[PDB]
Design a protein around this ligand. Structure first.
Ligand SMILES: [Mg+2]
Ligand SMILES: [Mg+2]
Ligand SMILES: [Mg+2]
Ligand SMILES: [Mg+2]
Ligand SMILES: [Mg+2]
Ligand SMILES: [Mg+2]
Ligand SMILES: [Mg+2]
Ligand SMILES: [Mg+2]
Ligand SMILES: [Mg+2]
Ligand SMILES: [Mg+2]
Ligand SMILES: [Mg+2]
Ligand SMILES: [Mg+2]
Ligand SMILES: [Mg+2]
Ligand SMILES: [Mg+2]
Ligand SMILES: [Mg+2]
Ligand SMILES: [Mg+2]
Ligand SMILES: [Mg+2]
Ligand SMILES: [Mg+2]
Ligand SMILES: [Mg+2]
Ligand SMILES: [Mg+2]
Ligand SMILES: [Mg+2]
Ligand SMILES: [Mg+2]
Ligand SMILES: [Mg+2]
Ligand SMILES: [Mg+2]
Ligand SMILES: [Mg+2]
Ligand SMILES: [Mg+2]
Ligand SMILES: [Mg+2]
Lengths: 36, 151, 146
RNA sequence: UGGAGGUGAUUUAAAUGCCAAA
RNA sequence: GGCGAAUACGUCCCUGCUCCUUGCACACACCGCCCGUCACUCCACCCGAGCGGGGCCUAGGUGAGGCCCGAUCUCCUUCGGGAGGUCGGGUCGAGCCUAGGCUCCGUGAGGGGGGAGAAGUCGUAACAAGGUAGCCGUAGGGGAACCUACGGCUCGAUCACCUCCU
RNA sequence: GAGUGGUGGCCACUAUUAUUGGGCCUAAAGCGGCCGUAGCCGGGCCCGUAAGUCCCUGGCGAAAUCCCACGGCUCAACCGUGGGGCUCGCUGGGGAUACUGCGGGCCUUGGGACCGGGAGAGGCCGGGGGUACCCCCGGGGUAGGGGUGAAAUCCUAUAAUCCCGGGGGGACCGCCAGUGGCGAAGGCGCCCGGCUGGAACGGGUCCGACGGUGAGGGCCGAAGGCCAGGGGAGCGAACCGGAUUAGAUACCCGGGUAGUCCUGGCUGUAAAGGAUGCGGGCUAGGUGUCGGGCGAGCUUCGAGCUCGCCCGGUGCCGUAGGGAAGCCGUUAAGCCCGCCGCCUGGGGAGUACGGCCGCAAGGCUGAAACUUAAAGGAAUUGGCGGGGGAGCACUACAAGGGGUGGAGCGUGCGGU
RNA sequence: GGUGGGGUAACGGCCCACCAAGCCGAAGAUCGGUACGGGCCGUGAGAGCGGGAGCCCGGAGAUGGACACUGAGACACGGGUCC
């Protein structure tokens, strides 16, 4: 992914690391359904 | 700065501004040419001949005498050697770089994991290619001449 | 960052290329050249439109304001799309009946969009059955056909 | 006087903000 | 008014208040601020079985009509020929049919996150050393914010010691 | 003011598209690092040419439209006669040579080559070691050891913890050690030997502009992960138990698989940060430290010590100047000459669709509908902290004396 | 692109027969999108940015797609033929 160091600031949002993990989990499911 | 390392060394020679040879110098032009030919026949490099002439015979650079045959230019060691047919076929710095590259390649055959030394080889070959382009432009090398390490 | 480049006398092509390249980062230029507004505009570039009323609704104001704003759903004659139009005035909703025809135009907010404390509404009613709504609100005129 | 680094440690548990301001 | 003691001559441990210094995403001033899942309402969008309808390329077949060259026929000739019908040959050709491949529009069972709203719910992850310092990369685990391991940064508080400077 | 308001579009506002004329340490923005092809930018002198460039002059670029004076409709708008401009573009000739281009000649300052005495955890290969830790065997001794805020799981009469004599194994190199050294960056620390890369200083040595940057392209690249074959001491994702808690999928405790280590490949990612791209010239001083050279003085004569100056690295304080400020300040974030990369309010979103690469995990490239009035930075005054320091109080404690909370009743309050 | 012809008012791969492997392209070919071109017009201190219906000059069309007769000139808006 591309870097947005502004997203790492914690004021008014959750941690960027776990958002990235959640997005990567979401993208796996779409890829699996595409192969079917 | 340096071509690759980007350092700023300043060491070098500081030649005073002068035109005529000094009074205390007693050698004539012919003696100097004979000395140069003798030293070349002993097997020295062009840069080494001038060093010996300066250190031992008390002769500052031979670029203080006009060329007796061509009055429009001054004398240099390479021109003196050309006047007798002892000049190198390949320019000396190119030959030295090629010689350094050949020795390093056979080291890297027994040490394939020496990655830091390999970058030195790449830089050396970059210098070689710059020089060969320049010498092709001026006509000092044949147009078909090519550098191949496998040779 | 060094000096701005290129500055050479014979470097016109690169300079023109650079200026063209970075002009696409301007959002106003991009929307005009690619014609993005015309692709999604329900009014199809017109300043006004005519439609038929389907039903009456009310929308709550945003915080920290309080109140209900009276609006209508309008189906456009020219393409059949359905939009929402605000009815300006005090008690103006009483002059609107279902199945009437109305003329609507932009509401006049920033960037050609919504305004005030009612986002989501982009249009307002101007005429009802070919009679000015402002007159009806003030008086001076009666709504035709009862 | 004022600064910049390094190594150590740092004794239980302790969540929340309604009413009102309107 | 009568009668008339015990203990301490201290400390900031508990409850609090004053001043110096330091951190702060707080100023309604920590009774502050603030995050995510599940439930409810509305809006735009994505994937998508099926279902219809259009447009382009190809390949094959067919082909109104046009032109040219032959043979023959009918009627007029100022005898030079002209006007046309029928058959044969060659060539060009709009359109039409079949098959294949790309592409557009309308519906669409089912699935997915996004944005507003205001509170139905469970917790308290971030801001002070936020009560386990916070954050980046990679990997595993968990109702949900999150937790753990290896390498990194200071955009980390307090005490003791050490080191290097002005 | 016979007009005056609403809606949509273009220019200006806007130096929010910047040639004139913007930005990129902390606010959006310098590729993780380097090598190099095209392009762009390129040191000094002499001779020639005349393509670029400048001057003069012929042939052209319709009219209408624009500007000026005069003239006709009452003046004007409008129209006519003259003078300019516009279509900035083309073409035939003549003249000049400062700059750029092209051809020839001559240089040494930038860059490269070579020689000398030295410096350094730069890299690869072989050998030899240092304590420490774990397991096994033998001797002594006997009831606990371990661990926490407090405990428990766990180990121990098959003799543990602790002490002594032996055998085996895998990883790692303490103090000295230093805003010290080396490397393009990632990174590099036991000792002896071999091979090898780069840099600084000293230089009347050699070549003679051979240079800077670099779209496409190439090579290197912490940890983790994957594919085959080994190894496995200690530590330790997942997992299994003991606790804490309202719950505790955690923090704390006892165990433990992958992994961490070696050989051959793949992946190409970090707060890969000096959050600061690289080359050149110039613009006060002061003071430490590392390498080389020079001078002077000491000396146990040491590759030793002290002081001064030059060059190159590495820190601190600071003048002019710069900046929103924090601050930077010859190691610039100052003034000037170059080249490439990137940014254009906050979200949606580094997402959807398409393409390339990879065994996989994943990498590079990258929108729109819609939504929103701020998001973001530096600094100020207060209030607060399960931050530090100093002080104080029987509506605080500590040392004491007497009580209230249980019963009946007096009186006040909520509720009914 | 060459050689030899045909056809045209006329030069030409405009069209044929034969001989070669050429031509264009990261200084953007090919393909896709959107548009008649210019003199001019709107705005701005200028450098620029945006438009090009109405008047003049040039191009193209006559419901869509093809094709001919007459003539100096047409494949003809108020002439002809087919789908
Ligand atoms: Mg506030
Ligand atoms: Mg709270
Ligand atoms: Mg917390
Ligand atoms: Mg915490
Ligand atoms: Mg876990
Ligand atoms: Mg504006
Ligand atoms: Mg700006
Ligand atoms: Mg930023
Ligand atoms: Mg960088
Ligand atoms: Mg960076
Ligand atoms: Mg020059
Ligand atoms: Mg000229
Ligand atoms: Mg004119
Ligand atoms: Mg008059
Ligand atoms: Mg007049
Ligand atoms: Mg006139
Ligand atoms: Mg024993
Ligand atoms: Mg380069
Ligand atoms: Mg680092
Ligand atoms: Mg220095
Ligand atoms: Mg300073
Ligand atoms: Mg894809
Ligand atoms: Mg009390
Ligand atoms: Mg007490
Ligand atoms: Mg009582
Ligand atoms: Mg146009
Ligand atoms: Mg008209």
């Amino acid at each position: 992914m591309k870097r947005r160091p502004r997203k790492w600031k914690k004021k008014g949002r959750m941690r960027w690391k776990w958002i990235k993990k959640r997005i990567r989990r979401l993208k796996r499911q779409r890829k699996k359904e595409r192969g079917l | 700065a340096r071509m690759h390392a980007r350092k700023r060394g300043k060491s070098g020679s500081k030649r005073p501004p002068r035109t005529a040879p000094p009074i205390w110098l007693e050698y004539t032009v012919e003696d100097i040419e004979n000395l140069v030919v003798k030293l070349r026949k002993e097997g020295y490099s062009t840069a080494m001949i001038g060093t010996i002439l300066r250190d031992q015979y008390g002769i500052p650079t031979v670029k203080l005498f006009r060329d007796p045959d061509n009055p429009n230019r001054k004398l240099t060691i390479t021109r003196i050697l050309e006047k007798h047919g002892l000049a190198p076929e390949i320019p000396e710095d190119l030959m030295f770089l090629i010689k350094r590259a050949v020795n390093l390649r056979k080291h890297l055959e027994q040490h394939p994991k020496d990655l830091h030394s390999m970058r030195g080889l790449q830089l050396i070959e970059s210098k070689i290619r710059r020089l060969v382009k320049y010498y092709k432009r001026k006509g000092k090398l044949p147009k078909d001449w090519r550098y191949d390490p496998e040779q | 960052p060094g000096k701005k480049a290129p500055n050479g006398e014979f470097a016109g092509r690169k300079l023109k290329l650079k200026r063209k390249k970075f002009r696409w980062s301007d959002i106003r230029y991009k929307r005009r050249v690619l014609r993005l507004k015309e692709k999604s505009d329900p009014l199809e570039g017109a300043p006004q439109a005519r439609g038929i009323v389907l039903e009456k609704i009310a929308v709550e104001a945003k915080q920290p304001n309080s109140g209900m704003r009276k609006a209508v759903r309008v189906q456009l004659i020219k393409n059949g799309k359905v939009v929402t139009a605000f009815c300006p005035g005090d008690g103006a909703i009483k002059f609107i009946d279902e199945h009437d025809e109305v003329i609507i135009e932009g509401i006049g907010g920033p960037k050609g969009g919504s305004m005030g404390d009612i986002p989501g509404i982009r249009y307002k009613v101007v005429k009802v059955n070919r009679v000015s709504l402002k007159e009806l609100v003030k008086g001076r005129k009666e709504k035709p056909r009862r």
